[PDB]
DNA sequence: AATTCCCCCCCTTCGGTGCTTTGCACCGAAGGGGGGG
C-alpha cells in the first residue's frame, strides 16, 4: 500500500451526481453489485462528506457497459505526482510514428488495494429512477479507474510487465496515460497488429491512430481576379487580425484602397504596390510561426469553432496568439443531424492528439451552452478520461480559420 | 422502541467544542407538552437525565403537527450545526406520481416517531444537552441529553434515511416483485397480487419493521383509495394534487403575491396553461415584505385566467412502460411556454411551464431549445428516458437556425405540430452585400469621463447625420449609430460598422431584449427586406 | 418576534469573473415562496 495525500490545504471532491437514464442506472447497479461482491467497492453511509459523479458508457463496438467515474476534481487535488506516473513525462518519439494503437489496461488497476486513509475521497452515489429510494453510496477499496494516482502506483508493476516485451522489441514506443496504453511502431500496417496481439497475449499471461498523417492548417487568403470593396474590407480585417500571430504583416498599402466612402459592391483594381504587398503577405502566411515552444509548466488550452457543414476548427495553445497546433475536424456525411455528437467526437479526437503529442489533456473552450452539454455529452462519450472544459457565451467574429 | 441498528459515527469539526447557548423563555402552554413529552421519552430511554458534569446546552421549543393535537419537539441546534462535521445527503429528489405504474393493490405506511427510534452515536450524545424550564420560575429546570436522533440537527435526515434503507434492504431482496417507494419514513407499497395476499405481505413487512423497532401505527396506515401520498391523491387509475386553495383577498402585499406565485407554480404540474409572469413582475423592485402592492390590469387578467383554470378538476394518469412518451410544447407569449407529457392523447401524464428569461437578448428558437432541455432533464429524472417532442416550429426553420448558428445546438427526435402561434425567425441577414442598395458607414464614440458621445453615419451617396448622445456609452453609441442607419435607409441597406459588440448582438437574430434600443433596432430590422451588416476595423 | 433540519422546484437580487470597448454579459449563491418528511 502506497500512502496518498491531497495537495496541502485542499479539502476533497464534493460534486453532486447528475441524473441518469434507466439503462445507465440498470447497468451501473449490475456492475456495482458485481464489484461489491468481488470486494472492489464497499457500501458507505452519509458520514462521508465527499462525492464524485458516476455514469456508464458503451465503448466503441463493445456491446458491454462500462462504469466511468469523473475524478476530475480529485485529480486536481491529488499530490501523488512525485511519481511522474508516465515513466519520464513524455516519449518524444511517439508523435513521429506510423501507427499508434490504444489499449485499455485499466482492469489491471483493480488488483492493487488503495490506501485506507484515501478511500473516503473516492465515494460516489448511484441514483434511482423516480427517486424511489435514496441513492446508494459506495467507496473504492482498490485503485480506481480514472484517478491520476492509479497509473502512478501501478507504474512499477507496469514497467515490470513490459520489460520482457520492450527489451525484445526496442523499436516500439509504449506510453501510458490513465488506463490507456499507446503502442507506437514504424512497422508494416499488418505487422503492427501482429505485435499488438503479441503484446495483448503477453499482458494476459502476466496476470489505431496515424500521427504521421496529422497536418496543421495554415491561415490562407482568398484568390480572386476582380476585388470589390467588400472583399478588400474582409481581407484587411483578416490580415489585421493575423498580424497579431505573424509579426511583419504590412497591410498598410491595402488600406489605402479603403479610403473614402464607397459602394460595397463595385470593384476596385488593385495597384501594383497593393499586389506586391498582398503577395508578400501570402508568402509570410505559408511558413510556420517561429518563437513558440511548449512549456511543460503551463497548461494547454484548446479552442473549438464551428464552421458549419459538419466542419470544426481547433487551436491548441498555451499563450494567446501562439498556437502550438491548429487543425480541422470534418465529419459531415449528411450533416449527421447532431451537433453535440460532432462536438463530443471532436473533443475526444483533440484530447487523444494532445495526449500523443504533449502527454497532457487540454482545457477546452466549448462553443456550446452549458445545459446542452451537461445533458447530452454522456450519450456519445467513449473515452476513459474526461478533460476539463469551460463554455463560451461570446460569438466569435468573422472566422479567419475557415 | 429504539432500533437495534448500528449508530453512525459522528464527530465535531476539528478544533471546535459543543454549544453553550442559553434557553430562551417559553410560554406556559408550551411548557406543559415538553414536560409531558420529555417525561414520556425518558420512560422509553430516548432521552437521559444529566447532571453538572455536562457543560453544554441548547434551546428547545415545540410546534404543532398536522394532527393539531400533538406537539413536535424541536431543538435550535444552529450553533451545533455550525460545528458539526459535513454530511453527504442521500436524498437526490422527490418521487412523482406520474412515474408510478398501475398496481392492483396499493398501501401507504407511516413510521411513528421516526427519528426517535434510531439511536445516536454515544460520543456525540453529550453535545445534545438541553434544559426544560420549570413552570413560571424557580426550581431550575431538568437537564436532558438525546439518546436518539434529534429533530433540528443537520445530521438527522441523512442518518435516518440510511438506517431506513438498511432496514428495508433485507425485505426488498427477498420480495423483488413488490414496489416500495421510500421517502423518509413514508412507504408506498404496491403490488399486482390479490388483496388478500397483498395484505398478508403488508403484515409481514410491518412485522419486519417492528423487529427493528420501527412501529407503524394503524391510525396512519391507509388501506383503501384514495391514498394521500406525498401531497397527492392516488386513485386506482388516476392521480390528483391535494386541493389547492388560492387566497381571495382584496389588498395584496408582497408576501401574499409570493405565496400565490408559489402555489400557482405548484399547481402548474397538473393544471395546464398556468401563467405566472405578470404576477411575479410585481415582486421586483419592492423591499418590504408587508408593503401593499396594487394589482395591475395585466396581473388581474392573468389571475382571473388562473382562477378559471383551477375551477375544473384535472387528473393525471400512471406511467405505462410499454408505450411511448410524447411531450407537446405550446408557446404562450412574452417568453412563456407550456408543455404536456402524455402517452395517449388527451390523457396527460403531467403538465408544466417554462418561463425563465436567460440572457439580455434572445429569440424564440433559443427559448424553445431551453424548454426542450428542461423537459428532457425532468423526463430523465422521472421516467428515465427522453420523450418524443411535438414542437410548434417548422423543420426548415430549425434547419436554417442550427446550420447558420455559431453554437452547437440540438433537439432530440421531434416532429412538427401545426398549432399557432408558430416559432419562427423574424428577419435574416444577407450573407453578401446587396447590389444597388445604399451603403451606410456608421460610427459611434463616447468619452468615458464626461459620459457624452456622438453617433452618426456617412453614405456613398453623400448624406451625413450626427446626433450627440448624453449619458451613454461607446457600445450604446455604436448601437444608436446602427439604429440611425436602419431608420434613415430604404428597404435595402448595406451597413458597415466598427463595433464587434453590436454585430455580435445583431447576428444572433434576437426578437426580444432587455434594452429598449435593441428592441427598436429589432423592430426596424423586421421592416426591411434585405439587410447586410459587415464589420471593418477602425 | 418567533426562533429547528434535510430534499426538489420557481422567481428576484447581488456579487464575482472574464474579455474588453474597465461596460457588459453570464452564472452561481442567497433571499422569498410552494411542496414533502
Ligand atoms: N418540522 C419538522 N422539523 C424537523 N424534522 C421534521 C419535521 N417534520 C418532519 N421531520 C422529520 C422528523 C420526523 O421524525 C420525521 C418523520 O416525520 P413525521 O412522520 O411527520 O414525524 P414523526 O414520525 O416523528 O411523528 P408521527 O408519530 O406523527 O409519525 O421527519
Ligand atoms: Mg411518522
Coordinates of C-alpha atoms in Angstrom, one line a residue, chain A residues 11 14-17 19-23 43-51 125-137 228-230 233-234 236-237 240 258 260-265 305-306 308-309 312 335-340 342-343 367-369 371-373 375-376 380 392-398, chain B residues 8-9 85-88 90-100 158-159 161-162 165 169 172 179-183 356 358 369 373 376-377 380-386 399 402-403 405-410 412 431-436 439 441 458-460 494-496 500 503-505 507 532 534-537:
Chain A
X11 CA -10.3 19.5 1.1
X14 CA -17.9 17.3 -3.2
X15 CA -19.5 17.2 -6.6
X16 CA -23.2 16.3 -7.0
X17 CA -24.5 13.4 -9.1
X19 CA -29.5 12.3 -13.3
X20 CA -29.1 9.2 -15.4
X21 CA -31.3 7.3 -17.8
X22 CA -32.9 4.0 -17.0
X23 CA -30.5 1.8 -19.0
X43 CA -21.0 0.5 0.8
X44 CA -20.7 3.6 3.0
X45 CA -23.1 6.0 4.7
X46 CA -23.7 9.7 4.8
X47 CA -20.9 10.5 7.4
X48 CA -18.6 10.5 4.4
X49 CA -18.8 14.1 3.2
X50 CA -17.2 13.5 -0.2
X51 CA -18.7 12.6 -3.5
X125 CA -23.6 7.8 -5.4
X126 CA -25.9 5.7 -7.6
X127 CA -29.3 7.5 -8.1
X128 CA -32.7 5.9 -8.6
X129 CA -35.4 6.2 -11.2
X130 CA -38.2 8.5 -10.0
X131 CA -36.3 8.8 -6.7
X132 CA -37.9 5.6 -5.5
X133 CA -35.1 5.1 -2.9
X134 CA -32.2 7.3 -1.6
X135 CA -29.1 7.0 -3.7
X136 CA -26.7 4.1 -2.8
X137 CA -23.2 5.3 -1.7
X228 CA -14.7 44.5 -54.7
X229 CA -14.7 47.0 -51.7
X230 CA -16.3 44.3 -49.5
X233 CA -12.6 45.1 -46.3
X234 CA -12.9 41.4 -45.3
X236 CA -7.9 43.8 -44.4
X237 CA -9.7 42.7 -41.3
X240 CA -5.1 42.9 -39.3
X258 CA -10.3 51.6 -48.4
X260 CA -13.4 57.4 -48.7
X261 CA -17.0 56.1 -48.6
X262 CA -17.6 53.7 -51.4
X263 CA -20.2 51.1 -52.5
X264 CA -19.6 47.6 -51.1
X265 CA -20.4 46.0 -54.5
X305 CA -15.1 26.8 -33.5
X306 CA -18.0 25.6 -35.7
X308 CA -20.9 24.8 -40.5
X309 CA -21.5 21.9 -42.9
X312 CA -14.9 22.4 -36.9
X335 CA -24.6 16.8 -41.5
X336 CA -25.1 13.9 -39.0
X337 CA -28.2 15.9 -37.7
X338 CA -26.4 16.1 -34.4
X339 CA -24.0 19.0 -33.4
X340 CA -23.5 17.6 -29.8
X342 CA -19.9 16.0 -33.6
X343 CA -18.5 18.3 -30.8
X367 CA -18.8 26.6 -28.2
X368 CA -22.0 25.3 -26.6
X369 CA -24.5 26.2 -24.0
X371 CA -27.0 22.9 -20.2
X372 CA -27.0 21.2 -23.6
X373 CA -23.5 19.7 -22.9
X375 CA -27.5 17.0 -20.7
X376 CA -26.1 15.1 -23.8
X380 CA -21.7 9.8 -27.0
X392 CA -18.0 30.3 -24.1
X393 CA -21.0 32.6 -24.4
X394 CA -19.5 35.2 -26.8
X395 CA -19.8 34.8 -30.5
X396 CA -16.5 34.9 -32.5
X397 CA -16.0 37.5 -35.2
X398 CA -15.9 36.6 -38.9
Chain B
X8 CA -23.4 6.2 12.5
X9 CA -20.1 7.7 13.9
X85 CA -19.0 17.6 10.5
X86 CA -20.3 17.8 7.0
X87 CA -22.6 15.1 5.7
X88 CA -23.5 14.0 2.2
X90 CA -28.6 10.8 0.0
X91 CA -32.0 12.3 -0.9
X92 CA -31.4 13.3 -4.6
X93 CA -35.0 14.3 -5.4
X94 CA -38.7 13.8 -4.9
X95 CA -40.8 10.9 -6.3
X96 CA -43.6 11.9 -8.6
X97 CA -46.9 10.0 -9.1
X98 CA -46.5 10.3 -12.9
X99 CA -43.6 7.9 -12.6
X100 CA -45.8 5.3 -10.9
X158 CA -29.3 11.5 6.2
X159 CA -28.7 9.2 9.1
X161 CA -32.6 7.7 5.5
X162 CA -29.5 5.4 5.6
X165 CA -32.6 1.8 3.6
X169 CA -33.0 -3.9 2.1
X172 CA -36.8 -5.9 -0.7
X179 CA -42.5 -1.8 -5.4
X180 CA -41.6 0.2 -2.3
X181 CA -41.3 3.9 -2.7
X182 CA -39.4 5.2 0.4
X183 CA -39.3 8.9 1.3
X356 CA -37.1 31.5 -17.5
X358 CA -31.8 33.8 -19.8
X369 CA -34.4 24.8 -27.1
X373 CA -33.7 20.8 -22.4
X376 CA -35.6 16.3 -21.2
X377 CA -33.9 16.6 -17.8
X380 CA -34.9 11.6 -17.4
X381 CA -35.4 12.2 -13.7
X382 CA -39.0 10.9 -13.6
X383 CA -39.2 8.1 -16.2
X384 CA -35.6 7.5 -17.0
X385 CA -35.9 8.3 -20.8
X386 CA -36.3 11.1 -23.2
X399 CA -32.5 23.5 -40.0
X402 CA -29.0 25.3 -36.3
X403 CA -26.9 25.3 -39.5
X405 CA -25.7 29.4 -35.7
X406 CA -22.2 29.6 -34.2
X407 CA -23.0 27.3 -31.3
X408 CA -23.5 23.6 -31.2
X409 CA -27.2 23.2 -30.6
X410 CA -29.5 20.1 -30.8
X412 CA -33.8 15.2 -29.9
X431 CA -24.5 36.8 -46.5
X432 CA -23.4 39.0 -49.3
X433 CA -23.7 42.8 -49.9
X434 CA -26.8 43.9 -51.7
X435 CA -26.1 45.3 -55.2
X436 CA -27.9 48.5 -55.9
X439 CA -24.1 51.7 -48.0
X441 CA -20.6 53.5 -42.9
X458 CA -21.9 58.6 -43.9
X459 CA -23.4 57.1 -47.1
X460 CA -21.8 56.7 -50.5
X494 CA -25.6 47.7 -46.5
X495 CA -24.4 48.8 -43.1
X496 CA -20.7 48.8 -42.2
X500 CA -17.9 43.8 -32.6
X503 CA -22.5 43.0 -34.6
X504 CA -22.4 40.1 -32.2
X505 CA -25.7 41.2 -30.7
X507 CA -26.1 38.4 -35.7
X532 CA -26.3 43.2 -44.9
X534 CA -20.4 44.0 -42.1
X535 CA -17.5 44.7 -39.8
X536 CA -14.5 46.8 -40.5
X537 CA -11.6 47.5 -38.1

